[PDB]
Design a protein around this ligand. Sequence first.
Ligand SMILES: [Mg+2]
Ligand SMILES: [Mg+2]
Ligand SMILES: [Mg+2]
Ligand SMILES: [Mg+2]
Ligand SMILES: [Mg+2]
Ligand SMILES: [Mg+2]
Ligand SMILES: [Mg+2]
Ligand SMILES: [Mg+2]
Length: 209
Amino acid sequence: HQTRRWNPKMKKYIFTERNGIYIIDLQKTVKKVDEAFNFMREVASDNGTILFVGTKKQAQESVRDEAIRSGQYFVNHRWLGGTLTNFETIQKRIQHLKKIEKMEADGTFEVLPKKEVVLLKKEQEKLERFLGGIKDMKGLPDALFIVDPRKERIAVAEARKLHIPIIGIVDTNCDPDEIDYVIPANDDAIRAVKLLTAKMADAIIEVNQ
RNA sequence: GCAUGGUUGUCGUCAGCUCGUGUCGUGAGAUGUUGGGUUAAGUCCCGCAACGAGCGCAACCCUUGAUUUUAGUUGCCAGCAU
Ligand SMILES: [Mg+2]
Ligand SMILES: [Mg+2]
Ligand SMILES: [Mg+2]
Ligand SMILES: [Mg+2]
Ligand SMILES: [Mg+2]
Ligand SMILES: [Mg+2]
Ligand SMILES: [Mg+2]
Ligand SMILES: [Mg+2]
């Protein structure tokens, strides 16, 4: 971002300074994204999965579209804590979701009273909003993808405690050590996030097809 | 009855009391149960390192307040006589 709120642990990746903000060197970025494409290719063809975490709005739409295109698993709304550690409780909740959806779609669509609208629809809508792509996550994600690491501390902490690789774009205002494998990019403009996430999904598809 | 098994005034019908899996602390512990609204209420919504849950609050309960069907003596009298 600006030259005030920045992390000195990323002075390697800054290059000169325009009037107002820092300027990121691009050659390091192209080397990093080539390496990231290679690693995503190495990891995708394993009958596993790759998780997408859309913290900010740009990330929201971008990761939703890219995951749907690639058929992967993603989280889009607020990341409720404990998905990668309380996975028992999360899977209980998603089993609840599947059962209620099945019964509402098949059985009767009318239990007994006029009490479906008051709670039994609003809570289902809210839970479907929060969970989203977890309804298909069979096991444990192999490599998270985060747009803004400093705006998603809970997810990176939960992944690092379970010790699974992390890939993500680190702006100048983040510490590039919590994420084990980094690409320096601006996570504030909708254009760049789309390009990077689409490249990651394309690499996954090309390797795993 | 201060060695124990089976109960009556008041705050006051006042809204509180906690567990599981998780995280944060060396530890006692904390979070959830804090914040902004809102309610008669921890009743509910949104954010939120937390996701659910049990006793409570609520509903199921009684009576009262309207109407339909079923049923007419000891109840009632409209049409009838008396
Ligand atoms: Mg940024
Ligand atoms: Mg004693
Ligand atoms: Mg007593
Ligand atoms: Mg008394
Ligand atoms: Mg008192
Ligand atoms: Mg500890
Ligand atoms: Mg309390
Ligand atoms: Mg409150």
